[PDB]
Amino acid sequence: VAKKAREGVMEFLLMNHPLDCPICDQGGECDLQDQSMAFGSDRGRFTEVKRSVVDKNLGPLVKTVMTRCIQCTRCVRFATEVAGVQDLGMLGRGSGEEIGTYVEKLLTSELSGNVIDICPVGALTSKPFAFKARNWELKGTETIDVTDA
Amino acid sequence: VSKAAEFVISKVDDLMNWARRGSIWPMTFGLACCAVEMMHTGAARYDLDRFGIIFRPSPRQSDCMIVAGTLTNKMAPALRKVYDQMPEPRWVISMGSCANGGGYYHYSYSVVRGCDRIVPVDIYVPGCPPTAEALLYGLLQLQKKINRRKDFLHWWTK
Amino acid sequence: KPWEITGPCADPEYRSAVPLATEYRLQCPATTKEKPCIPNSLPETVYDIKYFSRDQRRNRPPIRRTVLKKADVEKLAKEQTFAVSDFPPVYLNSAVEEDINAIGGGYQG
Amino acid sequence: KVKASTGIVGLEVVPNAREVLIGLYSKTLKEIQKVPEDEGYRKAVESFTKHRLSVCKEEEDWEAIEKRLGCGQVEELIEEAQDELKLISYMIEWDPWGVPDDYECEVIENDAPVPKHVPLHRPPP
Amino acid sequence: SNHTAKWMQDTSKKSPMELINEVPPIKVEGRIVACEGDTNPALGHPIEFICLDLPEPAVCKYCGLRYVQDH
Amino acid sequence: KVLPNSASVEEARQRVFDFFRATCRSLPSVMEIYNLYDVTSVAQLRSTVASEIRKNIGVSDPKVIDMLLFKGMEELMNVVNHSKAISPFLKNFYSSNYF
Amino acid sequence: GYLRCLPDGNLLQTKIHNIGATLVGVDKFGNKYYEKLGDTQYGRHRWVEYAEKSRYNASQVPPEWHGWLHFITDHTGDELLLLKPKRYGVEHKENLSGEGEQYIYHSKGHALNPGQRDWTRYQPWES
Amino acid sequence: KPGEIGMVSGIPQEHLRRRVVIYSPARTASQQGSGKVGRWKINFLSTQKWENPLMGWTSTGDPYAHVGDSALT
Amino acid sequence: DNQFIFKYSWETLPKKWVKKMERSEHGNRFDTKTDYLFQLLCFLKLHTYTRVQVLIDICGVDYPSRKRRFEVVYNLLSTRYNSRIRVQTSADEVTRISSVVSLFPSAGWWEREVWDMFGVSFINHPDLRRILTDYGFEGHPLRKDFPLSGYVEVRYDDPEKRVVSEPIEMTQEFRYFDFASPWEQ
Amino acid sequence: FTLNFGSLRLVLEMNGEVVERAEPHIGLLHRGTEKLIEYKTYLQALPYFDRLDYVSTMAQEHAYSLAVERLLNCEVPLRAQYIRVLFCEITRILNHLLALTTHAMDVGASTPFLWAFEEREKLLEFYERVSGARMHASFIRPGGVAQDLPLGLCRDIDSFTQQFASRIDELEEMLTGNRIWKQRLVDIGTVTAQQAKDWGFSGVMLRGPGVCWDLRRAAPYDVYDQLDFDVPVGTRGDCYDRYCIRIEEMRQSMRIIWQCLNKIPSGMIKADDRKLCPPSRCRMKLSMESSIHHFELYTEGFSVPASSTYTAVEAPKGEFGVFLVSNGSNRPYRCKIRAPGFAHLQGLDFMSKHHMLADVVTIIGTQDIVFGEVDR
Amino acid sequence: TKLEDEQREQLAKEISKDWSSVFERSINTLFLTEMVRGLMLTLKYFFETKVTINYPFEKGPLSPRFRGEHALRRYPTGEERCIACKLCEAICPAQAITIEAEEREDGSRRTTRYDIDMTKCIYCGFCQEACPVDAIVEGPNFEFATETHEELLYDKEKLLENGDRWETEIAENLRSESLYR
Numbered sequence A: 001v002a003k004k005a006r007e008g009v010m011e012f013l014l015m016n017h018p019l020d021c022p023i024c025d026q027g028g029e030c031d032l033q034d035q036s037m038a039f040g041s042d043r044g045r046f047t048e049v050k051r052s053v054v055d056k057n058l059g060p061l062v063k064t065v066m067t068r069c070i071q072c073t074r075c076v077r078f079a080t081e082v083a084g085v086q087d088l089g090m091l092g093r094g095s096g097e098e099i100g101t102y103v104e105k106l107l108t109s110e111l112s113g114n115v116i117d118i119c120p121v122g123a124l125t126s127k128p129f130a131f132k133a134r135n136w137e138l139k140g141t142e143t144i145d146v147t148d149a
Numbered sequence B: 001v002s003k004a005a006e007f008v009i010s011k012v013d014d015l016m017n018w019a020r021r022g023s024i025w026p027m028t029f030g031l032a033c034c035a036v037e038m039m040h041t042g043a044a045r046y047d048l049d050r051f052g053i054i055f056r057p058s059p060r061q062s063d064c065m066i067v068a069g070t071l072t073n074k075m076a077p078a079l080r081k082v083y084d085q086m087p088e089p090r091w092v093i094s095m096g097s098c099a100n101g102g103g104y105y106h107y108s109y110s111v112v113r114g115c116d117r118i119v120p121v122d123i124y125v126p127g128c129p130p131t132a133e134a135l136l137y138g139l140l141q142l143q144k145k146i147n148r149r150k151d152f153l154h155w156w157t158k
Numbered sequence C: 001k002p003w004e005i006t007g008p009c010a011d012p013e014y015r016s017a018v019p020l021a022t023e024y025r026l027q028c029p030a031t032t033k034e035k036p037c038i039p040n041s042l043p044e045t046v047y048d049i050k051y052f053s054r055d056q057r058r059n060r061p062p063i064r065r066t067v068l069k070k071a072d073v074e075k076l077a078k079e080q081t082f083a084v085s086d087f088p089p090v091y092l093n094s095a096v097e098e099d100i101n102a103i104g105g106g107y108q109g
Numbered sequence D: 001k002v003k004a005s006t007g008i009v010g011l012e013v014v015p016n017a018r019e020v021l022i023g024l025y026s027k028t029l030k031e032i033q034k035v036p037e038d039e040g041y042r043k044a045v046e047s048f049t050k051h052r053l054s055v056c057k058e059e060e061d062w063e064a065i066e067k068r069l070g071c072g073q074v075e076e077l078i079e080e081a082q083d084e085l086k087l088i089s090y091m092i093e094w095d096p097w098g099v100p101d102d103y104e105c106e107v108i109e110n111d112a113p114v115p116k117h118v119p120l121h122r123p124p125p
Numbered sequence E: 001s002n003h004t005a006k007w008m009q010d011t012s013k014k015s016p017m018e019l020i021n022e023v024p025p026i027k028v029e030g031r032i033v034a035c036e037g038d039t040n041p042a043l044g045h046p047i048e049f050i051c052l053d054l055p056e057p058a059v060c061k062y063c064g065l066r067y068v069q070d071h
Numbered sequence F: 001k002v003l004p005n006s007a008s009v010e011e012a013r014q015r016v017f018d019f020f021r022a023t024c025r026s027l028p029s030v031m032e033i034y035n036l037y038d039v040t041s042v043a044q045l046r047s048t049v050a051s052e053i054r055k056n057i058g059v060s061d062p063k064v065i066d067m068l069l070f071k072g073m074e075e076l077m078n079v080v081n082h083s084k085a086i087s088p089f090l091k092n093f094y095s096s097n098y099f
Numbered sequence G: 001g002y003l004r005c006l007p008d009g010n011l012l013q014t015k016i017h018n019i020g021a022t023l024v025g026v027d028k029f030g031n032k033y034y035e036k037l038g039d040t041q042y043g044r045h046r047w048v049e050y051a052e053k054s055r056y057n058a059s060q061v062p063p064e065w066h067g068w069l070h071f072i073t074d075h076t077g078d079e080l081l082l083l084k085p086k087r088y089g090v091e092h093k094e095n096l097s098g099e100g101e102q103y104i105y106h107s108k109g110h111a112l113n114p115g116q117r118d119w120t121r122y123q124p125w126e127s
Numbered sequence H: 001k002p003g004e005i006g007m008v009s010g011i012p013q014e015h016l017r018r019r020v021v022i023y024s025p026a027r028t029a030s031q032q033g034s035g036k037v038g039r040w041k042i043n044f045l046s047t048q049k050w051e052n053p054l055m056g057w058t059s060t061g062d063p064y065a066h067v068g069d070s071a072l073t
Numbered sequence I: 001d002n003q004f005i006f007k008y009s010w011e012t013l014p015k016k017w018v019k020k021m022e023r024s025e026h027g028n029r030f031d032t033k034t035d036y037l038f039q040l041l042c043f044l045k046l047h048t049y050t051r052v053q054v055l056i057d058i059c060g061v062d063y064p065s066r067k068r069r070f071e072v073v074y075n076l077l078s079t080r081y082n083s084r085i086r087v088q089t090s091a092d093e094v095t096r097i098s099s100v101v102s103l104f105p106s107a108g109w110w111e112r113e114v115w116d117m118f119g120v121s122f123i124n125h126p127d128l129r130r131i132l133t134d135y136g137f138e139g140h141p142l143r144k145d146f147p148l149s150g151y152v153e154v155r156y157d158d159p160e161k162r163v164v165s166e167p168i169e170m171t172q173e174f175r176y177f178d179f180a181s182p183w184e185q
Numbered sequence J: 001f002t003l004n005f006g007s008l009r010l011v012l013e014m015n016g017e018v019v020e021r022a023e024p025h026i027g028l029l030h031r032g033t034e035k036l037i038e039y040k041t042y043l044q045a046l047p048y049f050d051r052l053d054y055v056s057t058m059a060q061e062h063a064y065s066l067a068v069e070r071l072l073n074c075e076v077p078l079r080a081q082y083i084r085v086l087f088c089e090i091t092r093i094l095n096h097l098l099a100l101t102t103h104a105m106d107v108g109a110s111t112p113f114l115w116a117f118e119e120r121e122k123l124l125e126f127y128e129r130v131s132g133a134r135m136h137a138s139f140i141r142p143g144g145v146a147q148d149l150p151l152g153l154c155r156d157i158d159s160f161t162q163q164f165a166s167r168i169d170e171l172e173e174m175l176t177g178n179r180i181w182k183q184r185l186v187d188i189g190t191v192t193a194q195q196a197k198d199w200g201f202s203g204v205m206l207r208g209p210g211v212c213w214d215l216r217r218a219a220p221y222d223v224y225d226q227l228d229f230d231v232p233v234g235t236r237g238d239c240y241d242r243y244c245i246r247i248e249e250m251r252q253s254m255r256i257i258w259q260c261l262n263k264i265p266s267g268m269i270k271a272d273d274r275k276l277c278p279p280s281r282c283r284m285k286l287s288m289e290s291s292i293h294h295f296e297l298y299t300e301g302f303s304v305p306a307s308s309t310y311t312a313v314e315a316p317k318g319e320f321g322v323f324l325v326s327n328g329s330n331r332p333y334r335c336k337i338r339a340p341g342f343a344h345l346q347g348l349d350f351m352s353k354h355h356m357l358a359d360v361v362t363i364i365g366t367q368d369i370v371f372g373e374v375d376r
Numbered sequence K: 001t002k003l004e005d006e007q008r009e010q011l012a013k014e015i016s017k018d019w020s021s022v023f024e025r026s027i028n029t030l031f032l033t034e035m036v037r038g039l040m041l042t043l044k045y046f047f048e049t050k051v052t053i054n055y056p057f058e059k060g061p062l063s064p065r066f067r068g069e070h071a072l073r074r075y076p077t078g079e080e081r082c083i084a085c086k087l088c089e090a091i092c093p094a095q096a097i098t099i100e101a102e103e104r105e106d107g108s109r110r111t112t113r114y115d116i117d118m119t120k121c122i123y124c125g126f127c128q129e130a131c132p133v134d135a136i137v138e139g140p141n142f143e144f145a146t147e148t149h150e151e152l153l154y155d156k157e158k159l160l161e162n163g164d165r166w167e168t169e170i171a172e173n174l175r176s177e178s179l180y181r
């Protein structure tokens, strides 16, 4: 029962996800990819027309590809609870519901960089690190920061 | 320095280059798995005996060393020792990827990152394995390279 | 010709090595007269995708471990016995000395 | 009749195969009498040695004893008997019998299936 | 510009950026498109669906072709 | 021939002595192998071998002693078969950062 | 070019093979492509005369005729020329590789490159 | 004794005296999976990488550049 | 398959040295102590109903986490009864394990290879010189802690007129790509 | 006295031209294949098996794929199994031809070399048409094969089989029955079955004595249990009987090739599950899940369950085995490569005892030592 | 050796049944019948046609799925076909491909550096089958032997010009093989 539920939910998540993983900056660090390869099925029954969303300009740090968004509202309530500035929101109703700001409002906060970190899909990505490198290439050293105290 | 002496020197150099091009006597250094493709090159289809290529087992009588296969730290001294016995008019053809820059074992202990580190190689033949067609192309390229040797002119103008 | 006196050339069922250009490889591989159609899945597993049943990689029973002690070892040793029919079978084979033309007359392959 | 060849190049046909086997099996029983009775090795050795001695005593022809035993190659049987003598001598030379007390053995059993096309040694018929 | 000069030094032939800017936008009647790369889907790129509500041309992000809604 | 592990410090010492004997007897062969007669000083070579053995005294495990002797005999066979004031800190500082 | 046969001997073999052949095509570089079916073995029923008898090279075959010559395709070079892409593309160039430093390919960091690029991945202060 | 195995292992003596960092690599911030945590690595602090003059590649001279992160788990 | 002589062995083999047994379709496994490995292989080779008289190979596996990092594995075959068996033990860097050259003469080169790759020395080997790596090799390449590219590299030194060995300075360092998925467990 | 020969290095102790003992030095082609395989993913490690025992390429791919499938438990389709058998037998024919003709050249017979190379060129053309390159074609993968057969390949292979029956008859007529060939081969480097079992011989070198044991019949790892071929054995193991066994194996390989061509089925070429086999180009360009799985299979690999196994196949040289130990990750933790040249080259010492130098080279040719697999 | 002697005597008795057989065997061993037969076969092949390929003018057969020279393609419009997905070196077993990239001027994802070692490439086609956009292809060209290792060290510009030069043949092979996929 649990396995079938996971497979069905993965299929529904992937039925409208764009086939743009190679250009997606979350290659090898995308929760959709890993969970699809771990719990989801190996095939796709969907061959009809997908949905498409125009990109949003959210500042010089967050590059947004809203076609990849799975509408998990993880960043909508992050800006509400942790960031403290309520600009991002889930607006719309149904299969096509967009996320962001109604007006052109660049998101501005000290913690605004964490929005791209919690996005499971490559919907929100670091603009300065747009297409510089993948994940497996980078070696990670655990250090501390000196900009603040 | 004149225009008739220059013509005579050019004719002599052309004759010498023709002889050295038509009488290449390479020696196989057949390690790993470019040597089988080399034997295919020496077979009936892409025959080497037509162009003058005949494999001399003795390095003292050979013209150019064709290193085909992987060069190992245990075998590189042997390769250098055998190369040093070859006569002064000499050439090297590095066949494959192992003998060029280490190939598929570049990041490996006891593997020389190409025969260029041991002996001065003249022509590289890319491939893994390079087709017998490509190896014969490399031998023809060696013929072309030794087709522009102005040894007599260089000796005259010293 | 001297080579038809004896040897393989004298055999009526002798095949030449060289293949003719008009009969060996008629169509070049990049220009084939008929378009291929290679299947990639069974017809059943097209609109009935269900991976938790055909997940052959992960659907395996867990490894079972049992720590047998001296008492268990002695119990098994006393319980067990050997009979003439419980011994391992022998994988026996032997030469036959059979002619080369015995299987299908040397033709069937 | 007489066996022209045993097929195995190392093995050589022996005329008195039945007598050699009888002597080897009798010596096997006499030597295995020294092994402790509780050990399963002694029980198995007595079992198969007595069975082989009985069949080779009942059947006279080497072809008959081979056919009834089902192992074939009385020369191979003689080699096996000699190796059994050597093994019995070794297990008398060193004493492996008896559990060492406070002893634990980890029996591991996994039923992970394998495809039908991997190389698995099929049981003989 | 800087990127093109960084990967290429010929500076005599036309860079792919100039060619892809020179190819005109493709006018389509519908609100969404299917971008495949060329006439043969199997020889192009993975299919990309592009939304055309914004007035400006929308880059395909694959074989970028700038599809524009008709009206 | 390889021998079982030494079960006693005395046995390890005897094996060390045997290895040192082997090195001393094989020293003159290295003379003709390498040909550094100008500044070899065979006595100095023996002193250096003794110094290596003496700097390898901190080891006390007989197994480690036997392994060291095995590797030393291997090295001996290889050599026989001819297979080759500004303080320390400031010099390294002027050389490179990684020191 | 028939006088080259005496000191070439390989062009002689080609001319001997062009007795009963049919000229299936010719390229813009002058290479004449011949085909000869019938009583001919498989491996020797298509070939080329490079029209450069002095210094003919194996790399002078253009990509349009390369497949047909190598028996990859039944399509002659004319059809591939018709199908040649537009808006981009370069003319065929032989494998010089030794005819000159100004001809051979050089890396961006090689000293022989007309423009050599530094590689440090950081910008100094540059007072 | 703490070091006999190293001194007899055949590693060159110059690499047997170097500071290393033993740490458990933390979970990646990009994704919430916890199957790559709980492992411990030896971090040979080998940062001596430069740019190859010919092709701009990342050269190195320390043998322990990647073994601690690749093989030693 | 063919788990006949494996069960027969466990029925007849002395229980003193059978540290653990594994019944698997990937290969029946025996794990014992290094003291009794020679006796165990002698019993199997000589017994009439477990005649594993051919030694397929000897392998080594490195486990840096365990106290005895090295695992010496012996793959054996019984052609008379047509089945493969596996017998393995655990050894560390310094301790010497018994050699089975006397039983299986083919074991000499595999034991030399194990010495070369890991450092597990054998007690009764007629000789134990290195077989695979370069003359004068210093390390044991197949150890996990051993770097992939090694410690030294060779080149031709013109003044010395010989091929010399120098510490590694290789360009284009090995790029380790961490592909591991956090959801694989 | 000791005589040295210098990638085959060999030192011989001689008394009266009689070889008292021979010691080979083999490491000259060591390349760290096992270390590199440990450092690389399974798919990236398949070319290493391509390179090992390079005369017989696809046999090593078959062994590696069988080991991976055993550790992975994935079903291979019947068409993939049949084409794998067909190309394994083509590989066996190639290796036997090369071994026989190099042995003949070492003896002194030079002419069959080029005829068998014409046959080998035809077979390498088959390889190049079905896959990328003539040699080291990474065609056999875990779960199936890389690509389907091009059309016309079966007809070309049938024509080759007929002409190759003629060629084998031809070569046997020239070599077998020659007085010089017999004097070179018979009673040279004889091995008893006990000696072969002790020294771990396999394949022709083990069936030469007459142990009457073959891997394709003892442990059928393919449709081999549906191909009713023949396995020749030698009455008295020596060079001549091993050569005759190789000829008979070439004939039986042709037989198996014809049977596979006749009864090849129509279906798929690789495992059905995309978690273990990459999806097609159209599927990955059309389907979201297929794109995900292609991306994950080409960055990461299939994570085999943590287990250790030894999978052996009947390579043309002999029993080629791979011992794979995993830890649940995408890379093999340990990969031991048992090649059937490592044991035979040990056997050289006792085989070429009391013989002469020409007998030593004849024994080397008969054993067919490829140094890549012995230096794995 | 007594067994060998008696086996030899038995065999000699077996093959000396009668004077006809012994005379036939002696004549066959004396008059070199097998040698004559081998000579006749050799003469037949001397007089038969040859299979030499005549290299520079006649070239050996190939296949569209041939792994020759690595090369980079372009879209029909003219833009680079290669997005910077970095699936080349993720799968390249020999690690012969090095790639670096950044966002272009118009926001497109393109590679600012892409080099392949032809002395490290094993010519295996893993990249050309791992390409999601069919950007990198192993072209049909194989006669590209160079006199210098630095020449054999390719980069993005050389790969792109190779693709532009061999675009038509690469396209034909790609069509024929995309049929087989």
Ligand code: SF4
Pocket (backbone or CB within 6 Å): A017, A018, A020, A021, A022, A024, A025, A026, A027, A028, A030, A031, A032, A033, A068, A120, A121, A122, J292
């Ligand atoms: S986040 Fe989606 S678009 Fe990005 S690589 Fe993963 S499954 Fe693909």
Ligand code: SF4
Pocket (backbone or CB within 6 Å): A068, A069, A070, A071, A072, A073, A074, A075, A076, A099, A118, A119, A120, A121, A123, A124
């Ligand atoms: S965190 Fe990402 S996927 Fe979730 S709602 Fe925000 S943009 Fe969409």
Ligand code: SF4
Pocket (backbone or CB within 6 Å): B031, B032, B033, B034, B035, B068, B069, B070, B095, B096, B097, B098, B099, B103, B104, B127, B128, B129, B130, J051, J136, K122
């Ligand atoms: S370059 Fe390739 S084909 Fe040649 S020896 Fe190396 S691995 Fe073998």
Ligand code: SF4
Pocket (backbone or CB within 6 Å): K070, K088, K091, K092, K093, K094, K095, K096, K097, K116, K120, K121, K122, K123, K124, K125, K126, K127, K128, K138
């Ligand atoms: S063909 Fe193979 S070795 Fe060559 S660049 Fe592509 S993946 Fe690497």
Ligand code: SF4
Pocket (backbone or CB within 6 Å): K081, K082, K083, K084, K085, K086, K087, K088, K099, K127, K130, K131, K132, K133, K134, K135, K136
């Ligand atoms: S796989 Fe294709 S798109 Fe990706 S980096 Fe390589 S050539 Fe470019």
Ligand SMILES: [Zn+2]
Pocket (backbone or CB within 6 Å): E035, E036, E037, E045, E048, E060, E061, E062, E063, E064, E065
């Ligand atoms: Zn597009």
